[PDB]
Symmetry: D3
Subunit: 335 residues, 6 copies
């Protein structure tokens, strides 16, 4: 999949495209409707399916450091776009271009001159141009004859509007199950594993993996979650009895540095391993409990054992729910 | 108007004075009663009207960094004193002098030896001398024969006690209208304009002016306010269509750095300007709304347009209320 | 009293001991039951009475920077142990040894090989060995024949469980009287006195002593307390009219730096002194009031005088309660 | 003078203009040659004299926080351009536009479509377009009359923003001033320091951010002016008069810079006012003091030396202020 | 290869082993002599080749934050040991064990009870036990065949972790590489910088913590490789190919280090990928730039010099990468 | 000894006194001449010997955070004054009083009204009143008998707070001690470091703020004393005995100072105790270590050198401690 930063990086000999445009933060189920429609039309006419997206977040251009939390990193947005069949992503920076352009010139410059589009797919909530004057309705009238426009309704399901906003609200409440339901997959983060408390292995109380994430990353509320930890493909040696590319059952503690840097510390069920130096994916399945303070090692280990018990039950159920479950996983029936 | 720092800076040949003594933070309507009485008596007897005030705040001498927030800067206290007819301000630093003096020696040294006063005006709540032993009643008895004393009742109006404390409470609640009512003018701050989000001009979403204030400055609660922005007299060129010395209608967003440094970002109605490098006065008129987070540029601009609508209405009313309104102003009837 | 850090520092020719094992944070009334039983048995058999304790806190090994607040410093734990008749303290660091040992090998290595114990005294809640598998019951069965075991019930009195946890809860609520009741003494801190607001002496509003404590130190909730300040033995000269080794009546303000560094500022009743450079012990007796903000020096001094009035009453009562009262004290009947 | 941020801010009805282009940092004597040529032409033809300049500094776009120190602020660059008769400044941000463009489309977009220029004045070192391909040579060929002006050499010294920054960093403010064609200055609010009659408390305390070019740490002779204000002044100073001053430039150790001004023969405290400090000559390097007696002695010597140096500056009145206060002795 | 943290992590059923012991920082050519001897023996006897190493660095236990800079990370130490055929690494933390022990009980506890060693390979400088009393001499007497290998001297230079750190600190990466027996490298994620087609925006921006040994600030010729990934790549680079690159090493002033790579003749942005940067030779010391023209000119000269140096590296292909991209000219 | 903060704290019924005035930082041998003369007179006449001193340092009032480093703390200044027989110290804060006053009213307010002095002893360098106008000369004329004592010169060296600070900054503690008339020392609480029997873990770890004068970074021979306490001591040290020690002075890089004491032939941990560290002579400059073997070797050499130097100090017993512990060998 091609990735272009700014209109000037798009190949001049681009022949034809079907285009979808949006922030696409999270690539949730509504976003997938736009992408699927774009891919389908591109196939039909023998064109490239192109996503136009935005980095930095358009809100951050007006209100620096008050933009919405990123449901996914830009990199994972690319990975998700590719997985749903996008052939190219054009990333637009509103501090560089297209911020002060009229709706008419926006379409002329972006859709026609740059992308040579024959079809554009946008959500009902789409806006564009100076002071957000262009709407989904405007785009339909501006693109009369010149190219076909498919405006897709926002997705309402089980009485909830699926949007980046609603996914962020679920995460903030610790309702990862509802977040997952709206995303169409397990919410996840990926990152390197650092040195933490003790060394991973025989001690139940030392995490298998310690990670830190910056305060622009959307994470579930502080607490303990059932989930799956996967060591991403690697030839580096692994300390202990975990293999790369397998989803291992884990109890995951999300915390906040006492400093809004967040910690994600994973306790892998029934395994003795230390994952320092590896890149790992952590997917969240369900909430287990709120954070609490411990007054003794005995009490700490007791609560950890209960976390393991409930995690095992939640994950045994997740494996059945199954469109989301991992293809290759490890979960023991008991300790 | 003369400004003296410490008793030693007062001219030795000072002939005669009528004196008022207090912190005078805010120079609110009660303070104005003390000042007006002092100016009147000074005129009658051909004397100088002198304010004795205190910097740092007397509370900060005992409890550093727990003094009350400054309603105005010391500099603006001077400007306000001058505007009500004070001829000289004596600024006393309790870390340097007069902290451990008996009431008797306080009067002897300050009022007689230093200021050569024939009249003193104080509020009913006045205290002085070591461990605050001197009261308004004490001053009357100590100054028998030697000089006349006028003790003025604290101001109660519309069932509220007008004091620096009550003004601070109104500001903290976001009730700038009540603060203004107690002050007898629009609450304001002045400062240099810095570089902020984007550049001021055609974009409705970029502030016309970005400012920052230290955490010792009393400001209204975080939120959006209707008010007036004035570029103070200057020969420096101005980017865009604002002229110096005119009060321009503005929607003002008061925020807090996510760090208790406060931001004041002003969106000037119907103008396209960037005020970087200029000193500006921002006066607050009324509360418009609480702060909120924005999930899209469309939503942000929508709320900003509603802020403008309500600001225009509040300011059209302010112009009529009129003892406070600015003498030279710009406010369009519509966008 | 001997203090050994780690098993390797214990004398190889140690002949015989009666041992008690625990964190012992606070050396509260329950802890004293364990210590008293250990001292008694050691005397009976002509052995050394040994405390095995832990630093860092065992919880901090698993959850760094989330361990419980220290009721006392390690140093004061030593001082308290000595005062109840302990002959030696062995300090174990679980990052260095005994963390991953089986219960059987824990007893073999620590109690037999290192301490040559003939008797061990533990609380009903005692655990030991890898993943806390050893209990008070396990210890009894493991030590069959080899050495006698006395397991002492946790102390319940007046419907409260006396534990380090309950003492910490009382302190956090500002209930120093209940904390004191559980400890069997006045809760106290000791530290050097630094330069603070003004200089101690004639001014009622300047503290006699300013102190700061790190955020790992358990202190009562922010507010004002009645208590006793003692200058610890010293030949250094003392500014003002306080003598070393006398408990002086004081109103103590506990605060928090606006930074979780805590301040303890003591206003010594009826004394004029500045304690810069001295080490001082501050013991808490009862809560007087919550913290408040002051808008004037008059108001500040008024509240301070009321603090003195209530402090004098609370301390006059404390002197009668008397098992805790200080042996040598200064408290005037009136100002 | 108008100020436009970006090409889209420029009025569409701009009928005609004479344009000069450059960073113009310091608006030194070489820059004045370009501006003077641009203004003379415009006033001759009744057209607007336009300066195209750059913020952030073009280097900082490639190397953030490794750009050269600002000889003046952008605000003072506007003030100086206006003082030399420029009618409009267009400020270009290379992170927003005119970066990836070729020389051909740079000239078409900027000079023709945006500014409708009939005349353009540039330095011999001028470059433009992607990879700095465009040169003063490349501009001439593309038609719009083009005046290319040699870089200024005087007394064997190349006058450039670089050579001015060198003089300042070395503490040689006299040479800096000679290259600038005026006294180097900074302007800013006065903050609280230590308050007067006492010789050792500064009349004014100021701090500056680390991107501001200042002379090397040391003591300098200069002039302090209170900028026009109706606000009251504590002590015996009046606004809009240049007062003789010994100026101590320092660094906050363990690079926020301090500029503390001791005004000669005046007893005043300038807290809250905006003040202009112009530097005339170097007096001495920084030193540490072990007693008050020593400090006050060296300060009296700073004053003596300052009087002499400023007396000379007044006589060679080309750069001296028009209304000033300076006593011959205490 | 297995990795065991502490003696208690080692399998109890470890029947037999050939062991080498040391800090092994950098796994330089002297270290390879020890590892090669340990591996040859084990493969001969069908036993496990074991490396006992130390984290934290033994010096840091006595002098926290005064330990020598890490030539490689502990992770790269594992990767290198595995590359030379080591079957297990035992990592010892001296704050947990083997510190207060005598030489006798060190050997008994570590080599006999834990590793069941029949052969041990150590450097002539090896010491152990409390107060570094144990020596290579003291090890021989205690029976387990012991091979003590002289420290490596080549071309009149002692090859040690110390001499490698010296070469790096001086900017002499060529000599560092000669002592290492490979190109010195670092690996890490690429972060955001300034985004391409523009020569002056780096292809990849990286930062490193202050315990990482890096060459002296300056510009170096090297190779950048995108580590194996299925993630998409922006621009015309493929994973697992070594691309020619001019690498600028810098320091965040007022010691976080930056490593910014300008990949020759490629237009790409490697944000979010993990990248290996190997250093071949020094090009130039750091310098400041006063214009874009100057910056781009020096960058073109960096590219020219880099092409030449890398051409030489390719020819002397002992340390050169197996699959690489390098153009003879623009 | 009484301690009064400000003139208003002094008892009104103070009937008579002999006064000395000065900063008295370090209470060096020149200061002792003034104090001795003041005490002898008072004890002769049965009056109080009074020292008027200054906090903050008078320089810091003019130049905050540019004052000279404190040779001792104010607390140790009180302790030293008391040790030389001073009956009261009056501490003057120049930001509170005696600043704007003339020489005449300074003497009237301080010496007559406040202290009721019949005798005053000052150094030849003494100044007072606004702008340091008052001198030792100006004091004599104003009647109160006045003894002005020359500054101390010995072995061709001027003994002053300045020359003591110079010796310390250079690492020449022997010369500092000679000028002081005692071993230079600091006192403070011992904090946690790395815990013993191990030679390389310090017996005591301390930190000091950046206003404390300390010798240059390096290793020194000295004595460590645990100050009187009933608190238990871990290991084989007793309170109130001076133990031989190798003392490492260091700086927290990227200026908090460390003082880490390795007590000879003792196995102890002094966490939580207050400790006095006195410096006798310089052993070596700081160096970096690349191995534990090297570190322990140099530490053994530090111990050997320390034994020799302290043996000499004991013999020339004028500055040596009265009760000490020092072994001739391990």
């Amino acid at each position: 999949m091609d990735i272009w930063y700014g209109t000037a990086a798009v190949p001049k000999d681009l022949d034809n495209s079907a285009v979808t445009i949006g922030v696409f933060d999270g690539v949730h189920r509504g976003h997938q409707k736009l992408i699927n429609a774009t891919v389908e039309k591109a196939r039909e006419v023998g064109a490239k399916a192109i996503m136009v997206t935005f980095d930095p977040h358009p809100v951050s251009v007006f209100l620096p450091r008050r933009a919405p939390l990123g449901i996914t990193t830009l990199a994972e947005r690319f990975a998700l776009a590719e997985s749903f069949g996008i052939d190219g992503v054009l990333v637009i920076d509103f501090t560089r271009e297209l911020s002060g352009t009229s709706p008419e010139k926006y379409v002329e410059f972006l859709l026609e001159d740059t992308l040579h589009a024959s079809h554009v797919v946008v959500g009902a909530n789409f806006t564009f141009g100076e002071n957000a004057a262009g709407t989904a309705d405007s785009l339909r009238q501006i693109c009369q004859s010149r190219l076909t426009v498919d405006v897709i309704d926002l997705l309402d399901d089980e009485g909830v509007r699926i949007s980046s906003t609603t996914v962020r609200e679920f995460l903030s409440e610790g309702d990862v199950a509802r977040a997952n339901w709206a995303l169409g997959r397990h919410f996840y983060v990926t990152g390197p594993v650092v040195r933490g408390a003790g060394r991973g292995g025989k001690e139940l109380g030392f995490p298998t993996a310690n990670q830190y994430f910056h305060d622009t990353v959307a994470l579930p509320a502080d607490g303990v979650y059932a989930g799956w930890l996967t060591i991403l493909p690697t030839e580096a040696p692994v300390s202990g009895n975990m293999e790369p590319e397998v989803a291992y059952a884990a109890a995951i503690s999300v915390g906040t540095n006492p400093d809004e840097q967040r910690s994600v510390d994973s306790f892998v069920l029934d395994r003795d391993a230390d994952l320092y130096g590896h890149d790992v994916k952590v997917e969240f399945v369900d909430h287990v409990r709120a954070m609490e303070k411990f007054d003794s090692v005995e009490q700490l280990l007791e609560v950890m054992a209960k976390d393991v018990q409930k995690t095992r039950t939640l994950l045994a159920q997740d494996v059945q729910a199954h469109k989301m479950a991992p293809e290759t996983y490890f979960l023991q029936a008991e300790s």
